[PDB]
Design a protein around this ligand. Sequence first.
Ligand SMILES: Nc1nc2c(ncn2[C@@H]2O[C@H](COP(=O)(O)OP(=O)(O)O)[C@@H](O)[C@H]2O)c(=O)[nH]1
Ligand code: ALF
Ligand SMILES: [K+]
Ligand SMILES: [Mg+2]
Lengths: 766, 51
Amino acid sequence: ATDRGSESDKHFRKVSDKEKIDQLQEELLHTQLKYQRILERLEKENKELRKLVLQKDDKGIHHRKLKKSLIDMYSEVLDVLSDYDASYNTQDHLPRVVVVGDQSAGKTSVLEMIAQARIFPRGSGEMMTRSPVKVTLSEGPHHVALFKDSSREFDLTKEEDLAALRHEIELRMRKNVKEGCTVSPETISLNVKGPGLQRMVLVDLPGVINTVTSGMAPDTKETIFSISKAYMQNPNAIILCIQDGSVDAERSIVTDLVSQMDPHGRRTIFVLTKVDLAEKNVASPSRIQQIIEGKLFPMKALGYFAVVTGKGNSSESIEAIREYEEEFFQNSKLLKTSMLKAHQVTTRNLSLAVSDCFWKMVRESVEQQADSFKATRFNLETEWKNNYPRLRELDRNELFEKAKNEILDEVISLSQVTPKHWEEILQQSLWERVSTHVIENIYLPAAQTMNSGTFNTTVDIKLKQWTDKQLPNKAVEVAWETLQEEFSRFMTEPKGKEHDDIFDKLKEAVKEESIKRHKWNDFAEDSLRVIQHNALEDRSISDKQQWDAAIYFMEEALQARLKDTENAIENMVGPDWKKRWLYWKNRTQEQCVHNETKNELEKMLKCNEEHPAYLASDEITTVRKNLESRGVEVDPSLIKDTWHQVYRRHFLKTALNHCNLCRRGFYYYQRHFVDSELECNDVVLFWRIQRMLAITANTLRQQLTNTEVRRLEKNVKEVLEDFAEDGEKKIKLLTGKRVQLAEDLKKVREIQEKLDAFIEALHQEK
Amino acid sequence: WKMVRESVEQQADSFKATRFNLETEWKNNYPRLRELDRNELFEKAKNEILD
Ligand SMILES: Nc1nc2c(ncn2[C@@H]2O[C@H](COP(=O)(O)OP(=O)(O)O)[C@@H](O)[C@H]2O)c(=O)[nH]1
Ligand code: ALF
Ligand SMILES: [K+]
Ligand SMILES: [Mg+2]
């Protein structure tokens, strides 16, 4: 009878097994223990069956050391790195090839005529590049590129598919840009296969703008510079410097961006675009001869200075661009009358030369990263472990689940609270809430008559009306709060000096959802009304012990009121001579008035001890004249306020003296046959309420332990499952700086594997 | 029929548990009457009154 919710769950839980254990045992334990093992061993078979078919498309199985997915290893390493750390602290050490040049140059053309002319939005009229776009190029058949690493199935040779693919990239480009600028560092990941593509990662960084026009947000050019740090602070970056062939080199921006990155040109190759505009204006090949020699290019870029040319139409196909480029370069005086042989100028030579320089840098510098990340992990683990010796290995998934079980365990522990605590806490809390209402609004005005029948009649009518409207509504609220008060203590209270504060955000977050769903039984009040009516209706106290308990607790309530009034009075009247002379204090003129106003009222009560609480205006006038006769002029309102506090002090002392004789007078045996005027009807009123609330608490406790705590437990389970799926809150709640460090350690460990996997793939040559 | 077959078996356990809890308390408070009915109660009075 102490608790019934736990028994119900066990009974039906066994029933479920009795009917379905022959299916549950296989699914719940046998399958799950084998499930993890088969992931390593049997999924291996299905992965290999498809992988081999995919490798045949790659040709990796057919040809040793030659596989189109071999270059995809390089991108996988960077994809983890960008997710692990997209900031300069990690990005600055990641090898890459970047397209750098004046925005007007159309610098991206170096990549458009390879694969991107079909799927990347282009054309003049507006700035196209909005954020770094990385394209993973690989020798292979035509295949729809990955867009934001998402799979696609499109034909790259038909306009209808390509147009939709151009839309997809544009959406990422603009969405990466936030208010205040037109460019964003947030990168876009593309991976395309097709003929003529080289194994390398080329990034089209947003074009630099000398000045921010009114058509662009003010921070455009500063943002591009910060994005330009992808190479300016990256010793592993290869820079393709694009000179806008429409304008002279002395008008360029790229010269300063790269010359401050590598003034020796060791990390860069200079490329020129739109050279054919030289013949749409008065061509000056003598300036081109300086261009090839790098006289006017401070970065002294190394390699052959390739040139890109195009019809300028934004619909020219990749094949059309290649054919146009070859014919123009092989005949134009810009290159035929200067030392720029077309077979070195052609973009396809740049792609090969860029691919050649790409693998040179990657193999040389990649091994340094493996040592760097390993050193990082050891330094992080040493400090992380020393500050958190308890957690040698931690994850945010492990952190959440521990709380999930811990929370459910505590709420169950809350369900283990004995009724003794519930009944005492509910009874004590509820009575204290309504202890003054009865005294001030029911008892004291009823005490103004000497007719005990009216006294009991008056209160009973008020109580029944009060009972119907207030008592069960306050009682449930106390019970609802009382359960939450213990729940919070069970939930988030520390175990002395040991406490995992890392879990407090989730615990309180779970509570708020669980209390919102904690709807107390809407009919609990109806039972209490019947109970309270019966508890009040039965006023028969035939037991001395019932009398003894009721009177002592009534005294405490009255003594509390007496001190409450007395403390208010002392402030109203101030210190007496004992404290005025002891602490060198004095009275305010109001306190002086109150003391004399008090004295006159005390004298009035000294004789008229039975004076009713209500004062006649003649008494108010009498006091005023009695005080005015001593030089004290008092507003009637002061007297009435003084009167109320002093009267209760007078009354309450009388009531306690009545209580003293009620217990003592009846206690003496020979006095029980003396019918004195000591009808302790207040003890009858107090006793019934004490019993009435005690029964109320028991009804609340029964509902508390039978229905409400189970609803609280059920809601917690519903909320915790929502949190289990709510990754963002789990991240937002689990921010303890050790799980985040543990998360970083995991990512560092993964990168070390990914770094070595690619490095291991480099070592396939020997 | 999906809901009825799934949940109906729970009722059988619930009612059986109800009877055992009711019989335990009912029998303990009324050990004399292991089985009682309002028809048996009336007839006993009928004979008792006539006697
Ligand atoms: N004349 C000429 N036009 C080009 C060349 N490369 C690209 N374009 C034109 O520039 C426009 C878009 O090229 P794109 O590489 O996207 O430059 P961006 O949009 O300014 O970054 C298209 O209309 C192309 O025809 C080139 O080498 N010569
Ligand atoms: F014109 Al650009 F990136 F070269 F938008
Ligand atoms: K442009
Ligand atoms: Mg562009």
